[PDB]
Every structure is written in structure tokens, then in C-alpha cells.
Swiss-Prot record:
Its main location: cytoplasm. Taste-modifying protein; intensely sweet-tasting. It is 100000 times sweeter than sucrose on a molar basis. The lineage of its organism: Eukaryota, Viridiplantae, Streptophyta, Embryophyta, Tracheophyta. It comes from Thaumatococcus daniellii. This is Thaumatin I. Keywords: Cytoplasmic vesicle, Disulfide bond, Signal, Taste-modifying protein. Belongs to the thaumatin family. Pfam families: Thaumatin. Disulfide bonds join 9-204, 56-66, 71-77, 121-193, 126-177, 134-145, 149-158, 159-164. It is found in: Cytoplasmic vesicle. PANTHER family: OS03G0233200 PROTEIN. InterPro entries: Osmotin/thaumatin-like_sf, Thaumatin, Thaumatin_CS. GO terms for cellular component: cytoplasmic vesicle. SUPFAM superfamilies: Osmotin, thaumatin-like protein.
Length: 207
């Protein structure tokens, strides 16, 4: 499948693409404002994620740091990024269907559109100003809005027992982004696409 990753942000982001134990394609890249990065994702990719990273420094070997979504200091991600990270999440060719979603379960750093570029289902969007509205106790100093599980490390926020409810913090992300996951047992906002759909992830789809 092709993912076009477009930075519509006025600031540089470092796109990341990972299934948690491996890079997707090159796994990461600098996107200046307006730049597009086309990646190929293997059919059958299960638990694929795309995210933006903000305020990166990389040396000549692609080693360094980001204030948001840093994945063990690499330009080319093999691992998931450090929260806060708005997540484009995908499982491709699962019994003839694609599953896409946006998640705020690892917090929010960069507004995001995740849309098919092929026909047969709808995109999802989390483009509200979650960083600007972020509750004082979830504010990441580096930039972005932590989820309550990253900050407080409780069974309730992490949903560690497989049982828990919405929270004051999960409802803040849900109120600003109804179409994103807000907590682990949130009513699914997963969209079903045709198997082998293609996608665009847009950072700052409106701003």
C-alpha cells in the first residue's frame, strides 16, 4: 500500500512509520512545511503506526533527539515514538479489509488527517487545538498533550486489568476529537476500508 505523508504544518516535522519491532519503509524523514513523503507499506502489515515528531536534532548518522515522538534517538524509526504522539494507526489486508484510526491514547502533539486516497470509505481527523486547550497536568514541557496513562501510570488510565471507564482526561481528548480513540476501551472509531486501499496522512490538515 502507498501512504503519502504530507506536512501541511508551518513548522518542520520528522515523519515516523513503524509497526513497533520494525521500520515501515525508511521508517522516518524530515518533512519541511509543504513537503510530501511517499512510503510503501507491505500488504498484511498489522499494527502499523505513522506519527509526527517535533523539534528534532539529528547528526550525520541519523542519531539525535525529538521533543515529541522520539523513537530511541533515531531519524529512521524501528520502534514506536515517546508520547505525546497523535497516532495514524493501521492494520492492512486483515481478512480482506483495512482498519485505520486516529488515536489520542498516547496523547497528542500534531493535528492529523488520516484519509484513503482510493474509494470505499471515509478518512478520520483529529485537528482541534488539543495542545492549546490541554489540561495543566497533561501539558508536556517539550510541547504537546500527554494522555493520563503516560502521566499518572494508574490501572484506570492505562486500562491495565482490561476493565476501566472514560475519565476527566480521556473526555478532554474525546470532546476535542470525537473521531479519535481517547482511552483503551473507547467505543471504537476504527474505519473499515477495502483490502489494499492507499492513504494520505496530513499533518496540520486545516492550519
Amino acid at each position: 500500500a502507498t501512504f503519502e505523508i504530507v506536512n501541511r504544518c508551518s513548522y518542520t516535522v520528522w515523519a515516523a512509520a513503524s509497526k513497533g519491532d520494525a521500520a515501515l519503509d525508511a521508517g522516518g524523514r524530515q518533512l519541511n512545511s509543504g513537503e510530501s513523503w511517499t512510503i510503501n507499506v507491505e500488504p498484511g502489515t498489522n499494527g502499523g503506526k505513522i506519527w509526527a515528531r517535533t523539534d528534532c536534532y539529528f547528526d550525520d548518522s541519523g542519531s539525535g533527539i525529538c521533543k515529541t515522538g522520539d523513537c530511541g534517538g533515531l531519524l529512521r524509526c524501528k520502534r514506536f515514538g515517546r508520547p505525546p504522539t497523535t497516532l495514524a494507526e493501521f492494520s492492512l489486508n486483515q481478512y480482506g479489509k483495512d482498519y485505520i484510526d486516529i488515536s489520542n491514547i498516547k496523547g497528542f502533539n500534531v493535528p492529523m488527517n488520516f484519509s484513503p486516497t482510493t474509494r470505499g470509505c471515509r478518512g478520520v481527523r483529529c485537528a482541534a487545538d488539543i495542545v492549546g486547550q490541554c489540561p495543566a497536568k497533561l501539558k508536556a514541557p517539550g510541547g504537546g498533550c500527554n494522555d493520563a496513562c503516560t502521566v499518572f501510570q494508574t490501572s484506570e488510565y492505562c486500562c491495565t486489568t482490561g476493565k476501566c471507564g472514560p475519565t476527566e482526561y480521556s473526555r478532554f481528548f474525546k470532546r476535542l476529537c470525537p473521531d479519535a480513540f481517547s482511552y483503551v476501551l473507547d467505543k471504537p472509531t476504527t474505519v473499515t476500508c477495502p483490502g489494499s486501499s492507499n492513504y494520505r496522512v496530513t499533518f496540520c490538515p486545516t492550519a
